[PDB]
Structures are given as C-alpha cells and as structure tokens.
Amino acid sequence: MAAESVRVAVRCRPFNQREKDLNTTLCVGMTPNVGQVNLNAPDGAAKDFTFDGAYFMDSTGEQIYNDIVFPLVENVIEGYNGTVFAYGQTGSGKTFSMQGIETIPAQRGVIPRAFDHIFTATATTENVKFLVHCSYLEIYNEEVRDLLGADNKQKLEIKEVYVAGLSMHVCHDVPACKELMTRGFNNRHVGSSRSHSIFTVYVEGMTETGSIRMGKLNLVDLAGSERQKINLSLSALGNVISALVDGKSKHIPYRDSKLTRLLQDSLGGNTKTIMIACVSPSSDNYDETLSTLRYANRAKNIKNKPTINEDPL
C-alpha cells in the first residue's frame, strides 16, 4: 500500500582469464556490512557509494537470491507485482546473475531460482490454488518480438500497458518454465549485446474466502550499458530514471522507447523493483564501472507505490 523505493544491489564479478593474464589492477572495493562500494582511480583516489547490497567477486547467486529476490517472490505470490532487472556493461555479469550456471550449484541465477521458489511455495499453500503463466519478449532496435510466439520474427504493437498479441504460456511445474527459457534463447536476434529481454511469470492465486490475487514477476536482462535508434531504449531508461529522481520532472517521459513504455509500472508504479548493477573489477573498465555505479546510485531514489492486486469476487 505504501511508497517503496527501488532496492539496488551492486554485484562485482571476479576477474576473467584475460584480466588475470594482463595483470589488471583491482580498482573496485566493497564492505558488504553497510552496502559500501568504493572505486579507486589509478593514483589511489577513491569514490564512495552506498547501496542496499554489495556483492564482491566471491558472491553467489544463492546468497543474492536469499537476501534480495526471495522476499520479493514471496510478495509476488501474495498478489504483488515484482521486477528484477540486471544493469551493467557487456561482460559485467548481467546474464550470470539472471540465468547463471548449473555446474557450480550456488551460482544458479535468479530466474531458475524464482521458478523453483514459485513452484515449491505454491505447492505448500493448501489454502490457495494457483495458475502460473509465463511470457518472454525481446526488444532489438525498437522492434518488440515474442520469443515464444508462432512467428518469432514478427514486430509487436503496445496498447494501454500490454504487448498486444504476446503469448502467455501455462506452466504446471519447474520443467515447463525451463522449456520456455531454453526455446526462447534460440529465438534471439542475429540479423545479444544491444537488445533487451523480459521474462514474465504471472501468479494467479484463488483464495478460500473467494478473492483472486494477480501478481507478476518481470525478469529483465537489459542491453550493455557501455557508451555507444539502436540505443534509444537505453538512453530513454536513463532519462526516465533522471526524471523520476530529479524532483522537478512532473511528466515522466515513459513513451520515448518500447522498453520504457513496458517497464513504466516498474519505474514509479505499482511494483516492487530491484536493480542488480553488475560491475567489472578491473581498472581497464574504470569509466564504465563509474558510469554504472552513478546510474544505480540514482536508481535508489525511484519512488514506487506497490499495493496488493487482489480483487474480491
């Protein structure tokens, strides 16, 4: 019912083989106890930032999920809208935090964890019956496409907010969700750096009193945040966040891109939103990391108004 700011967590990825070979300097510092993130310049001069979560090179998707995503997914199951999106330059770790890996068990991402969590929590609740639906879309060069639809290479129209004609796939267990994510990656545009993608899980709960709640979860993997209408949605996103927090902007320019129009309810609206800002640890990425930290620091101040979406008969 009440005003709720956007939760922001920073996740610094570990060095990569090449950063180790080059003998790259660790310019990023963290003190997770108070969500502190520092960025050291080549001379030593540090820049300090405070976030709701700081995850250093040794962090797992298992610990980020438990701390930040798990209470949001419980909120979704109660009839709330929830949005989790990854922000950061190409290479920073956005996809590793969203999808993750299944050969290091603690490094499974927030997406397959939300599937296991939703299906386990809905199976334990005997006082509410549940219908799970799943959609998956991609926005490349302002062209919205349905990664699950019958014609995966067709542009879609938006009406008000919804993507008019997007397929909503019913899921009866976790493997049904995993089949859509697998088939959705094969429908990505080739003719994954400059495109964005939204995977939504809708949780409809019918209670014994009779009322029905409808909460949805948006799992957003954004395009690379690196400097340079291919970048229209990314520039509009920053402009939207800027308008939302600058205090002078009475009119938020959501209609300036396909991504901002869709995620409009997740930025200032009836949604509990979480941003996962992914950063690289190496000094060769100083400018992009500084850009991402400043951008995520501004996102902290977006004021949403999430309420329970539960209509009684």
Author numbering: 0 to 159, 165 to 195, 203 to 239, 254 to 338
What does the study report here?
OSM‐3 belongs to the homodimeric kinesin‐2 subfamily and is the Caenorhabditis elegans homologue of human KIF17. The OSM‐3 motor domain shows the typical kinesin fold, with a central eight‐stranded β‐sheet surrounded by 3 α‐helices on either side.
We reasoned that, by adding apyrase just before setting up crystallization trials, nucleotide‐free OSM‐3 might be incorporated and stabilized in a crystal before denaturing. Indeed, OSM‐3 crystals diffracting X‐rays up to a resolution of 2.3 Å were obtained in these conditions. The structure was solved by molecular replacement taking that of ADP‐OSM‐3 as a search model and there are two virtually identical kinesin molecules per asymmetric unit (rmsd 0.44 Å; 308 Cα atoms aligned). The structure of nucleotide‐free OSM‐3 is however very similar to that of the ADP form, with an rmsd ranging from 0.49 (chain B) to 0.55 Å (chain A; 304 Cαs aligned in both cases). Finally, we note that the overall temperature factor of OSM‐3 was unexpectedly high (about 87 Å2) for a 2.3 Å resolution structure, likely reflecting further the instability of this kinesin in the absence of a nucleotide.
